Structure 1
Amino acid sequence: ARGPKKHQKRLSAPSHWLLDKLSGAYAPRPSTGPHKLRDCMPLIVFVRNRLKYALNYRETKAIMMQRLVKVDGKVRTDITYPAGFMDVITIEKTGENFRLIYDTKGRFTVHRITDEEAKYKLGKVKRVQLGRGGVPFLVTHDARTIRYPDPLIKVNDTVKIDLETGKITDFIKFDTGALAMITGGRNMGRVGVITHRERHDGGFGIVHLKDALDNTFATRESNVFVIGSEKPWISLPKGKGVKLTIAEERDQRRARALAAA
C-alpha cells in the first residue's frame, strides 16, 4: 500500500491491553523493537492505565524522558517501547521492581519483586551456530546476541543472563520432567510438567503437560517456555497458574468476602 503503515486504529488493538472502546479513536501503536507488535507491553499503557501514576498523555512522556525508569538496566526514553515476556523493569528512585509475566487468564499483572532477584533473566534460544571468523553465538527472545557460549547448549533450551555483563550463568535442557510456562494460545499462563514429547517431521509438533492437580493439556513446542526443571527459578504470581474453573472460583470468592467482612 505504497509504504509501511504508521497508525493503529482503536478497536483493533490486542485484547489483553484492556482498553475501553470509548474515549478516543486511536491506540498507542507500539514502535518496533525486540518483541512482536502483537505480543508486547507498551510503557505508556503501563504507567497511565495500570500504575495510575499519570492522568494524561502529557505527563506520561515526562516520566520516561526524565530518565526515571529503565527497562533491563538501560534507561530508554521512547514512549511506545515494546516490553515483552520475562523482561525486568525497574524504577529505582521509588524502589519498585516489576516483571512482566502472565496470569492464568492470559494477561499482564503488576508483580512486585525484591531487589536481589531483579538482577537476572532467562530466555529461550531460537538459533545457535557460528558467525563470521568461526566464533559461535546465540540469540534469545529479546534480541540479545551472546557469543562464545557453552558448547553443550542446544536449540530450544533456556539460558540465564546476568543483566550487567550479560553472560550465561546456567542452562536448562528440554526433555521430560521439566517445568514450563506457556506464553501464547488458549493455555496462556498455565504451569505444568513435561510428560512426554511427540515429533512430526515436517512441522508443528505437539507436547503433553500435566498440571499439579493432575490436569492435562497440550501445546506446540514453539509456544512453551521452560523456566525450570524443579523448584522454579522465578517468583510465580498469585494463583501459581492452576486454572480453576468457573464453578469453584465463584464459590471460594464469596466465602472469602463474607469471612473478611
Structure 2
Amino acid sequence: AKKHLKRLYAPKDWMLSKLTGVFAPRPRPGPHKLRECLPLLVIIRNRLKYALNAREGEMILRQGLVHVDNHPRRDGKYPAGFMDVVEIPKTGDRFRLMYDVKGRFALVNLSEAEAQIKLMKVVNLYTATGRVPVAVTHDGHRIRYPDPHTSIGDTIVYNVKEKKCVDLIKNRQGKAVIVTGGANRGRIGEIVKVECHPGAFNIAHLKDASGAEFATRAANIFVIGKDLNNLQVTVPKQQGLRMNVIQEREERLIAAEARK
C-alpha cells in the first residue's frame, strides 16, 4: 500500500498551502474516508490553532486530551470526519463537525449535554452470528440491536456517553435533510419527492426554507430533523441556506465599508 499523501493530492477543504508543505498527513484508516475527513493533526493545528507545528500537534494528541465520541484519540492521522463530537476537557471546547452552506467543514460549538446527542446514518442492515440484526453507520460503528423499524437510509440518534440509541428518524418525504456530497453539500432542505431508479443512483429532490428547488443523489442527504422548522441538533451559522453570489458580494462589501 501507499503511505505518503502529496500536498496537491490532499483535499482542498483542509486549507493547507502548496508552498509550505510538500506532503500532507495521510489519514490512516478508521471511521471516515480519507477524502471526507480532517486528520486530528490538521484539526488541532490548522483549525483550532492550539498547535504551532506538527511536532507540537503530536504533543497534544498523544496525551489523550482530544476526545472523539467520548473516547480519547492519540494518532494525528485519525480521520475524525463529519458529525463527530470533539471534546478537549482542558479547554472544554465541546464542538461537533458539520458542513456549512459552502460545503466545507465547520466546528459547530455545542452546549452542555448536547454532546451526548449524536446522529449517524444507516448504510447496511445485516444479521450477525446467532440471528442478530446489526446496522452499520457512516461512522463505521455497528449497532448490535437497532430499532425493529430501522431501515437503510434512516439515521439513528445515538448517545455517545450511554453507547445506546435513543430514537430513530425514518427517511421519508417531508423531512429535514442535509446534503453531504458535491457542491450541493452543506444545505439543509426538505424532501419533497425522491425518484427511485433501480440499479442506478437515487435522485433526491429537495426544497430549502427559502424556497429554492435543488436536487442531488439520495446517498448524499442526511436526515437531521422531523421537519425543517425543528432540528434535533445545532447546525452551522448560515442555517443551511445558500444565498445568491451577487448578493453575497454586495453585503460583504457593505459590511467592510461599515468598519470604515
TM-score scaled by length of structure 1: 0.95
Unaligned runs of 5+ in 2: none
Deviates more, 1:246-255 or 1:70-79: 246-255
Q: 1:6 aligns with which of 3, 7, 17?
A: 3
Q: 2:102 aligns with which of 76, 81, 105?
A: 105
1:212 aligns with 2:243: no
CA deviation map 1:98-123 (0-9, x unaligned): 11101111111232111221112111
Matching residue of 1:130: 127
Matching residue of 2:75: 78
CA deviation map 1:234-253 (0-9, x unaligned): 11111112111211112222
Matching residue of 1:64: 61
1:166 aligns with 2:163: yes
Q: CA deviation at 1:256?
A: 2.9
Q: How does 1:33-52 map to 2 (within 5 A)?
A: 33-52=30-49
Q: Secondary structure at the match of 1:49?
A: helix
Matching residue of 1:147: 144
Query: Quick one: which amino acid aligns to residue 38 of structure 1?
Result: R
Matching residue of 2:197: 200
Matching residue of 1:27: 24
Deviates more, 1:48-57 or 1:30-39: 48-57
Aligned residues: 258
TM-score scaled by length of structure 2: 0.95
Query: Quick one: which amino acid aligns to residue 97 of structure 1?
Result: R
Tell me the distance in 1 between the aligned counterparts of 2:224 and 2:174. Answer: 12
Contact 2:122–2:153 (Cα < 8 Å) also in 1? yes
Tell me the distance in 2 between the aligned counterparts of 1:54 and 1:126. Answer: 35
Cα RMSD of the aligned pairs, angstroms, is 1.3
Q: CA deviation at 1:129?
A: 2.6
Tell me the distance in 1 between the aligned counterparts of 2:158 and 2:171. Answer: 18
Matching residue of 1:234: 233
Tell me the distance in 2 between the aligned counterparts of 1:89 and 1:135. Answer: 31
Tell me the distance in 1 between the aligned counterparts of 2:6 and 2:253. Answer: 39
**Aligned residues with identical type, % of pairs:** 50
1:247 aligns with 2:246: yes
CA deviation map 1:61-85 (0-9, x unaligned): 1101112111111111011100111
CA deviation map 1:207-237 (0-9, x unaligned): 1101111111111111111111121111111
Q: CA deviation at 1:146?
A: 1.4
Tell me the distance in 1 between the aligned counterparts of 2:206 and 2:219. Answer: 14
1:258 aligns with 2:250: no
Query: Quick one: which amino acid aligns to residue 100 of structure 1?
Result: L
Query: Quick one: which amino acid aligns to residue 33 of structure 2?
Result: K
Tell me the distance in 2 between the aligned counterparts of 1:228 and 1:5. Answer: 40
Q: CA deviation at 1:260?
A: 4.9
Unaligned runs of 5+ in 1: none
Tell me the distance in 1 between the aligned counterparts of 2:43 and 2:196. Answer: 39
Tell me the distance in 2 between the aligned counterparts of 1:11 and 1:34. Answer: 23
